[PDB]
Amino acid sequence: RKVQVSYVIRDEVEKYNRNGVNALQLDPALNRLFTAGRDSIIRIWSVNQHKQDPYIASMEHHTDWVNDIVLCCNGKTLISASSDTTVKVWNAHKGFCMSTLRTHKDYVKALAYAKDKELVASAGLDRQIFLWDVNTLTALTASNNTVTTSSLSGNKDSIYSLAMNQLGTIIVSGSTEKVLRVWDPRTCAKLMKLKGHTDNVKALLLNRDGTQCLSGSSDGTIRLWSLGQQRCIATYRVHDEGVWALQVNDAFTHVYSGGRDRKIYCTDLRNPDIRVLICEEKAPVLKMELDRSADPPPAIWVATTKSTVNKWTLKGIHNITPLCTQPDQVIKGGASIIQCHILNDKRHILTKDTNNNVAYWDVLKACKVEDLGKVDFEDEIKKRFKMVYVPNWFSVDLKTGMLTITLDESDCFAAWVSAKDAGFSDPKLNLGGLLLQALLEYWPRTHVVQKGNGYFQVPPHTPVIFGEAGGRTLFRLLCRDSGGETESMLLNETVPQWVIDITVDKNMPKFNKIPFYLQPHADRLSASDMLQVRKVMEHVYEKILAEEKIELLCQDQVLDPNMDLRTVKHFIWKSGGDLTLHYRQK
């Protein structure tokens, strides 16, 4: 595929989630909470009430939604699944990624854990389920980096949930097949095919002995299965909308459920008549984590589509009006950029976030210019309108709630801008070439010594990402880390030729031309796109001081002499033919 260069405009430290939280893990030994965010960052929090700042560390190596995390090996290792089609092994005590598994071909959505055998399974949208041994993964080294893969098979649609029992002898898969498939992880052999759900299944549970299964589906029903009888022994219709999260206690007698309807319930399994409404969240519930320190669980952690993670006490469930009204503990969250507009100069972007704040950003310098507050976004677009046209040279995606700018070979160098039009003091400048040199400034291969493009510098903490167009992430690094030994070898392998030509070979991109034929108002010419009208005025003057005696017009409209033909063709021409300019005496 074609390699793209992308980077994120962000702060050095992002303490709070900038998007929703997909998964939760609780460490009882250190009293630590792990949040798998939709902003591609895993964060560690302290659940102690004494600390007024629960933030501990950020675990930032993914490039897309983190869908599931499991805490294994007594809280020393974290396994994460993500939409970037990778499974990653982490040091949960320190907070750095150790290795990346690239066996999946689509989004990885579910992780299953067997505590006794230390066995972890990863399943995703590619209909593949892979089995991993954590100790084998944790003992991997640079020299010894080979692993034998054992994959389950027989699933005809994309998996959305996965489950294992404590002993690691039963694994259940939920998918859009509307059926549940069960295997034996030891022998990698099929056992049964549970049926009865009429929609996608997103939540799965199993007991310690692995003979009973709890499933919740988008149809709004919770079904209790018996693996010995291979049948559904009970069906619970508790929620108005789909069920997305499930939690059960150690006795496997009470199930905690939540989903799209934003309501969380505690349902008694032996008789569904005892139903307690724990709370009503402000957003659809994506995942829930129980506090298993005491029996019954004192509290439950809830992750929603909002950036805030809340804890709800369970004091009095066994002792409709909700049980709780305000969460006991709150972990703050940031704001997600939801709307984006690129201004006419193709250098500044106005963004609006979930708090309705409007901000002004500089793509070239990869920094925020100013905050505007709760200003009308559409009015601000008109207020900053300019009479200029610059070709598109970058793309913007807001999947992680942050500004990610993508540079592709097709249009990276399509924007030529004179230095006077920009804020740099006129030599002729290519925005795409300047940005690439600033991103790879610390790379020794680009030094011939001068550093960078000599006009601006992106923040050193800017994450630079190399990846295939609609594919995998080849290499990810910070801007300031390009000078390292290990990063330089990786950069040589991953940086494509079209970036090498400009950053290493120091070549200059093409100069595009528009052909225009002058006609007297009542001879084809081609010139640079940034050529001003004044130059065409003086060319006619020699054909027949130049500005004062000659006026140019297009489509029966007078032309600004300081304006360029690139702006003329885009705005005033309003036609599919070659640009036509008419010269008439003033």
Partner: protein, 285 residues
């Protein structure tokens, strides 16, 4: 003297079908009268041909490049529509006869939020093979829930992300004539699929309708294509008279009358017919 009829069998098949469409010639003569005293050539030429066929049909009863057929029907109905809209500046012959409305529903599999689009349609394009099948299977491949995954993921504006989605089409407003465009052609390279579906005489679209309706449809015209390639061939039309109840086989310059049962057996894919059905027309009962 009529050996040149075959050179335009694509247009002849469309005109033969349009002639027996209930109300098509009734509506065309209404427009012809309005254009008559207004003093456009397409309506006038259409009326002359309809009169000419009426003379021929009465005599029959008393004294016994290469072009796509669907594309030609599209141009004829489109040009009739434009003239009707010009007459505004009754006049809803195309809208009432052939134009219906679809509701296209997309459901994201992450947030489970529903988005809908409303689009007009004049025919229903359905596949003939998967990659013995009936017409119900073809419409199911058209209007039942399909999951778009992998390289064809849906971009949810609620999630601001590429997500798997379910797409379903529903029939909101039904026209009097339901045209079925059969994709009896595949790609690897382009070829023609010679195996037809099991075409039923009765069609119920309640399975894919926004509301439960008891309106049924009956087949009255079939446009077939004979040939082993899609680049060239011959078009024939079999219409139904509503002699009533029999099927008229228009083959260039000759007309054949057959019983309804006989024509149905000729449409069976088991017999491997040489004429591959291409357009099915159903009228509301």
């Amino acid at each position: 003297g009529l050996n040149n009829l075959g050179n335009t069998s694509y247009l002849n098949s469309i005109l033969q079908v349009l002639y027996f469409c209930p109300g098509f010639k009734s509506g065309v003569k209404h427009l012809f009268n309005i254009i008559s005293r207004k003093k456009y050539e397409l309506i006038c030429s259409l009326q002359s041909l309809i009169i000419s066929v009426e003379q021929l049909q009465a005599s029959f009863l008393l004294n016994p490049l290469q072009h796509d057929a669907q594309e030609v029907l599209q141009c004829i109905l489109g040009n009739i529509q434009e003239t009707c809209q010009l007459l505004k500046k009754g006049f809803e012959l195309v809208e009432k006869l052939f134009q219906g409305q679809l509701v296209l529903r997309t459901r994201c599999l992450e947030c489970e939020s529903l988005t809908e689009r409303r689009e007009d349609f004049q025919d229903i394009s359905v596949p003939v093979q998967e990659d013995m099948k009936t017409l119900r299977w073809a419409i199911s491949q058209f209007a039942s829930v399909e999951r778009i995954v992998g390289e064809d993921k849906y971009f949810c504006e609620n999630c601001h992300h590429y997500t798997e989605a379910e797409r379903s089409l529903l029939f909101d407003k039904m026209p009097e004539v339901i045209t079925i465009h059969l994709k009896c052609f595949a790609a690897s390279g382009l070829s023609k699929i010679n195996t037809p579906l099991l075409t039923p005489l009765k069609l119920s679209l309640e399975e894919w309708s926004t509301k439960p309706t008891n309106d049924s449809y009956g087949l009255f015209a079939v446009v077939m294509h004979s040939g082993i390639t899609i680049s060239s061939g011959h078009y024939t039309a079999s219409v139904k008279v509503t002699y009533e109840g029999k099927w008229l086989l228009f083959d260039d310059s000759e007309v054949k009358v057959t019983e309804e049962k006989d024509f149905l057996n000729s449409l069976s894919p088991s017999t491997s017919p040489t004429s591959t059905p291409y357009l099915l027309f159903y009228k509301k009962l």
